[PDB]
Amino acid sequence: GSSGSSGQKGWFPASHVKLLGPSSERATPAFHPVCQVIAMYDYAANNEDELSFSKGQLINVMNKDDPDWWQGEINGVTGLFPSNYVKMTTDSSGPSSG
């Protein structure tokens, strides 16, 4: 909804904004993540701050600024989860050579 924390800047995003003027655009339908990973173990968000997902859930890493914790999405749901509870899917682009 709004800015929750201001003083503490532990985690920082990786998005660069070069727009001049009134930048008021509704959430864009198209998003460009950084990578795609899969849940290794059913993760249960202790609170609304974390992301609640199961083993083999669709998680698209968008910001991995933290080598310990990563951020992904699931069915239009964004949260926070450790980079240790996911394994790079490495989705291959194209069928095997044959």
UniProtKB/Swiss-Prot annotation:
<feature type="domain" description="SH3 5">
    <location>
        <begin position="32"/>
        <end position="91"/>
    </location>
</feature>
<protein>
    <recommendedName>
        <fullName>Intersectin-2</fullName>
    </recommendedName>
</protein>
<comment type="function">
    <text>Adapter protein that may provide indirect link between the endocytic membrane traffic and the actin assembly machinery. May regulate the formation of clathrin-coated vesicles (CCPs). Seems to be involved in CCPs maturation including invagination or budding. Involved in endocytosis of integrin beta-1 (ITGB1) and transferrin receptor (TFR). Plays a role in dendrite formation by melanocytes.</text>
</comment>
<comment type="subunit">
    <text>Belongs to a complex that may contain multimers of ITSN1, ITSN2 and EPS15, and different partners according to the step in the endocytic process. Interacts with ADAM15. Interacts with FASLG. Interacts with ANKRD54. Interacts with FCHO2.</text>
</comment>
<comment type="subunit">
    <text>(Microbial infection) Interacts with herpes virus 8 protein K15.</text>
</comment>
